[PDB]
Amino acid sequence: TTSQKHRDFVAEPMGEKPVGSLAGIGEVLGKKLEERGFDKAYVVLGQFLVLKKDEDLFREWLKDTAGANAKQSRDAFGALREWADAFL
Amino acid sequence: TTSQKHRDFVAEPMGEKPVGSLAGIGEVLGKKLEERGFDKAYVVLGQFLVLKKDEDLFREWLKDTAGANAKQSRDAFGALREWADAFL
Amino acid sequence: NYADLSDTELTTLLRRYNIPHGPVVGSTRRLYEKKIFEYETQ
Numbered sequence: 001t002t003s004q005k006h007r008d009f010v011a012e013p014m015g016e017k018p019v020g021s022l023a024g025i026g027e028v029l030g031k032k033l034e035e036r037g038f039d040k041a042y043v044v045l046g047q048f049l050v051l052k053k054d055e056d057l058f059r060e061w062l063k064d065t066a067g068a069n070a071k072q073s074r075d076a077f078g079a080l081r082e083w084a085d086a087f088l
Numbered sequence: 089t090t091s092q093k094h095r096d097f098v099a100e101p102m103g104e105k106p107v108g109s110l111a112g113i114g115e116v117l118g119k120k121l122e123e124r125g126f127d128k129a130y131v132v133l134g135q136f137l138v139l140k141k142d143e144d145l146f147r148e149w150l151k152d153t154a155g156a157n158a159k160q161s162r163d164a165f166g167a168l169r170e171w172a173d174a175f176l
Numbered sequence: 177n178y179a180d181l182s183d184t185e186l187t188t189l190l191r192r193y194n195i196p197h198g199p200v201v202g203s204t205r206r207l208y209e210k211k212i213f214e215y216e217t218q
Contacts, residue, residue, distance in 0.1 A: 013176060037187065037199035042137050042176055049134025050203045052127075061201075065183070087175060088101055088130060140198040149207050 002075055009041070010082040017041045024068070024075025032066045048080045049088075055081075090163050097129075098170040105129040112156065112163030120154040136168045137176075143169075178209045186212070 006023035014021070020030040022041050038044050051057040058080075059073040068076065094111035102109070108118035109129050126132050139145040146168075147161035156164065178186065183200040189212055190197040200208055 043140060043199060046134045046137025047201055049130050050138055052131060135203055138198055138201055138204060142196055
């Protein structure tokens, strides 16, 4: 479930976790993200940080570049925001 | 004061530290990074992460963005790499 | 003029030339265009 993926992602350092571990990143989004060079969850975290953790900027970027819908971009944004609040 | 800056940088999560907290990022480099929009150390961490922790890409980007020489870029990279091995 | 290339097309050139790279995003576009230019002209 989405809640379980979010809870598991924010619970611990991400290390070398694949991009698919991020809540909101299913098979389709994960494959598009991997095609763009976002193989690991940390690469997506990098873009979130370069965008200064801005929700509107990150969500617009994920929707336009990877084909994410509003729900998926919110779930992925939320997992990264809460992970950074806990560990960064 | 590079070794002191490196030790303090890699010891804890970076939170809201400014870019000048990074080993290698002195007054000239820090001011230039902030003028380019890399206003916090986490923004530079973000860039290191979107560059897949690649030393050559990171050091080339830093030289082009802030005018870092080889030594400054080697030190900034090393501090981010050791921090990411510990906390990311 | 690499501006006409999409991020996907820029990524494809970096891969074709075996130039190590990560994602093409707003903060890396300038770097990868410079690297492509230097590799093509030198």
